[PDB]
């Protein structure tokens, strides 16, 4: 960070990567923010050993998953930093227990059920997804190179 | 090999990768070009074992292998023995399957 | 002590927060109905009036028709259309409509492309079919004529009409047997009831309570850093 | 995604068929809502072996005003025109001569 | 990729740009339509013959 | 030239009156703005759907030709659920000559007037007669007719 | 002509389910990439494999 030429290049790369993609009403201007704000919270939970940052990071990731199908990218900083969170959890099995430190981490994943089904039921979301699959243009997983 | 990759997590991840590559392979028709296409089993459609494709089966196996690798990742386990049987020479079998 | 009450809360508000949030997509709602009837219209002098109702979902969920015939099918010696559900002048009118034709010898109740019932016109005007029932709901698609030995039909469910109005070519003022009833598919226009809202706020307060209890439980294991970060510097402000 | 996306379209009726009798005959469909009772037509399709030529009859322009900065016609065919930067399109000859 | 927009806006002004619309919306506090002010339409195209 | 396809026609010259596209179609006329031309016209009102039924638009706003024929006629088709389902069966099209203010070389798009097939003298709009029920979160009575 | 910057076509023709890229016409490339890339990443880490 104190390198006068490693910060200018970071700013230039951020600009060159943000300008061509994220300017409209797409959900990517928010997914790209949720990814880094989940990364920083996971890193704040790993060091300075605390679990509530790693519990708000799951809420942010759940708010980011329900933005667009490409929104589950915000889970990668939570999956790559899961062994270290397990290591800061298993240091409390004697103190409080593995249940009192994973129940708050499991009740946070259960906020998608309020984010999604706040106006519509389950039989409505099922029919919506069925229509969007049987009608619109969806390409399979084995054709992923089609993106590149 | 189990003597060069000593951790079960890495070998399970490689087995998952092999299964995913097979799933990608089996996601197309079995057509040959002009007259070798006379009488081929699935010369016009993606192979199906009945309702469900064969690429879906290999993908559902690769997902389970990746979940096993992730569970060996979290708990920091490297001495597993079932992965020593499963991940012994997985490339010869994956190539012999396509050859057969 | 906050070392035990918080451990209790971080469980009794985490498990309850999972339960009261997982039972959200099942609780009741209140959806609105929408039913277009017919006649409804004195029109020019005393007749009935066509209607325009461009449903966005395409097909409705119920299409009761039951028009009469003995005093109604008085088209001028050669009929074009009785009770179409699309304007006959559209680009694809009969390809996705209903179109009870008259054809001057056979009164056939068409559908998407298929014919669903046929009757001899010379026998249908004279008072043999008091009903021309064209029921087209989601479970059955039939066009019974109620009085001809064999004038009835049934189609696959995927032959449902497209309702973009009710357009007839009749001049009857109003009949004690003339009707129509279209139930629009307003399944996405739900509104949460009181129970669903109460459970939502309860299961959303349980999550916050569990996370606050976790924060108070972390007070004993917080690694305190030695405060060795620093300041910003010039070349980062620039 | 495994084949090109080939399509074609017309605006509203530009590219249509026949219509009612115009002013000089010309039972042709006039687009844009041009009234055929006040709009003659001329055309060179059909006389493909004659090298057709024609000259109009000195239509009178209104006094200049910055609110109507155009003189527009309807083409319906293949016409030679210059693009924004030099480039051409084969077409045929059509021009407008002031006076 | 910044000059290819600032130049396209400074040049070609007014004529119409996606930046001139936003500048007009900023100046007019948000009661000036973006492209319905540039486009000129012609109703009744037989009264101009 | 004497080739089979090398021909043309013309029409008496006209100096238009050139009323702008904001006094022509104000902020109350229901217009159908395609996917591309909906951010450039932010003061017009798109036709509103309500209670299942829709109100019929009066004009349409179209992108350029190549964008139209590949993105507006294919996405909003009647065989996919687009707004053409009830527009192709109830409205006829007519073109309107439009121009940018000073870019006489620009294909900005086009505008189309809609003329009703059945005039509104007869065939007026319908009364909806709405109500309310108390369905649960799993009913899903019957599927939706989405297959063409 | 197929200028050099259009090389993604060789792999675009491979993922389409046609006779060109079939079940058997993918092995030659996938069993090379899948055996080359992890072996490269493992020869980078380890410098003595005995
Ligand atoms: Ca010629």
mmCIF file of N, CA, C and O in Angstrom, chain D residues 8 10 15 23 30-31 33-34 36 39 44 46 49-50 53 79 84 91 97:
data_model
loop_
_atom_site.group_PDB
_atom_site.id
_atom_site.type_symbol
_atom_site.label_atom_id
_atom_site.label_comp_id
_atom_site.label_asym_id
_atom_site.label_seq_id
_atom_site.Cartn_x
_atom_site.Cartn_y
_atom_site.Cartn_z
ATOM 1 N N UNK D 8 -35.090 -10.791 -40.875
ATOM 2 C CA UNK D 8 -35.402 -9.694 -41.783
ATOM 3 C C UNK D 8 -36.739 -9.103 -41.360
ATOM 4 O O UNK D 8 -37.583 -9.793 -40.785
ATOM 5 N N UNK D 10 -39.582 -5.341 -41.932
ATOM 6 C CA UNK D 10 -39.966 -4.088 -42.558
ATOM 7 C C UNK D 10 -40.584 -3.193 -41.495
ATOM 8 O O UNK D 10 -41.038 -3.672 -40.452
ATOM 9 N N UNK D 15 -42.786 -1.907 -48.144
ATOM 10 C CA UNK D 15 -42.482 -3.205 -48.707
ATOM 11 C C UNK D 15 -43.738 -4.031 -48.886
ATOM 12 O O UNK D 15 -43.687 -5.263 -48.882
ATOM 13 N N UNK D 23 -53.816 9.098 -57.848
ATOM 14 C CA UNK D 23 -54.160 10.264 -58.658
ATOM 15 C C UNK D 23 -53.924 9.998 -60.138
ATOM 16 O O UNK D 23 -54.744 10.367 -60.981
ATOM 17 N N UNK D 30 -49.131 3.089 -50.672
ATOM 18 C CA UNK D 30 -48.287 4.190 -50.234
ATOM 19 C C UNK D 30 -48.084 4.113 -48.728
ATOM 20 O O UNK D 30 -49.070 4.143 -47.981
ATOM 21 N N UNK D 31 -46.850 4.020 -48.244
ATOM 22 C CA UNK D 31 -46.629 3.892 -46.800
ATOM 23 C C UNK D 31 -46.677 5.227 -46.074
ATOM 24 O O UNK D 31 -47.010 6.255 -46.671
ATOM 25 N N UNK D 33 -48.646 6.603 -44.365
ATOM 26 C CA UNK D 33 -49.926 7.277 -44.320
ATOM 27 C C UNK D 33 -50.116 8.338 -45.377
ATOM 28 O O UNK D 33 -50.909 9.264 -45.173
ATOM 29 N N UNK D 34 -49.408 8.238 -46.499
ATOM 30 C CA UNK D 34 -49.568 9.198 -47.583
ATOM 31 C C UNK D 34 -50.903 8.968 -48.276
ATOM 32 O O UNK D 34 -51.186 7.859 -48.738
ATOM 33 N N UNK D 36 -53.408 8.533 -50.975
ATOM 34 C CA UNK D 36 -53.274 8.271 -52.416
ATOM 35 C C UNK D 36 -54.123 9.179 -53.286
ATOM 36 O O UNK D 36 -53.874 9.251 -54.496
ATOM 37 N N UNK D 39 -51.352 12.021 -54.166
ATOM 38 C CA UNK D 39 -49.960 11.589 -54.273
ATOM 39 C C UNK D 39 -49.763 10.736 -55.520
ATOM 40 O O UNK D 39 -50.145 9.555 -55.542
ATOM 41 N N UNK D 44 -39.778 2.417 -62.225
ATOM 42 C CA UNK D 44 -39.015 1.856 -63.331
ATOM 43 C C UNK D 44 -38.894 0.338 -63.279
ATOM 44 O O UNK D 44 -38.045 -0.219 -63.983
ATOM 45 N N UNK D 46 -40.289 -3.190 -64.291
ATOM 46 C CA UNK D 46 -41.167 -3.728 -65.310
ATOM 47 C C UNK D 46 -40.697 -3.348 -66.696
ATOM 48 O O UNK D 46 -40.770 -4.150 -67.633
ATOM 49 N N UNK D 49 -35.985 -3.157 -69.932
ATOM 50 C CA UNK D 49 -35.230 -3.128 -71.180
ATOM 51 C C UNK D 49 -35.349 -1.795 -71.913
ATOM 52 O O UNK D 49 -35.360 -1.784 -73.149
ATOM 53 N N UNK D 50 -35.436 -0.675 -71.195
ATOM 54 C CA UNK D 50 -35.711 0.605 -71.830
ATOM 55 C C UNK D 50 -34.787 1.737 -71.389
ATOM 56 O O UNK D 50 -34.770 2.782 -72.049
ATOM 57 N N UNK D 53 -35.812 7.105 -68.005
ATOM 58 C CA UNK D 53 -35.391 8.435 -67.584
ATOM 59 C C UNK D 53 -36.630 9.301 -67.402
ATOM 60 O O UNK D 53 -37.642 9.104 -68.080
ATOM 61 N N UNK D 79 -31.046 2.862 -54.894
ATOM 62 C CA UNK D 79 -30.622 4.184 -55.335
ATOM 63 C C UNK D 79 -29.183 4.431 -54.903
ATOM 64 O O UNK D 79 -28.760 4.033 -53.814
ATOM 65 N N UNK D 84 -21.748 8.738 -45.196
ATOM 66 C CA UNK D 84 -21.256 9.891 -44.449
ATOM 67 C C UNK D 84 -19.813 10.214 -44.813
ATOM 68 O O UNK D 84 -19.430 11.389 -44.869
ATOM 69 N N UNK D 91 -26.886 1.035 -56.228
ATOM 70 C CA UNK D 91 -28.161 1.656 -56.544
ATOM 71 C C UNK D 91 -28.330 2.187 -57.955
ATOM 72 O O UNK D 91 -27.731 1.673 -58.903
ATOM 73 N N UNK D 97 -32.668 18.786 -58.145
ATOM 74 C CA UNK D 97 -32.085 19.954 -58.794
ATOM 75 C C UNK D 97 -32.860 21.198 -58.386
ATOM 76 O O UNK D 97 -34.041 21.337 -58.722
#
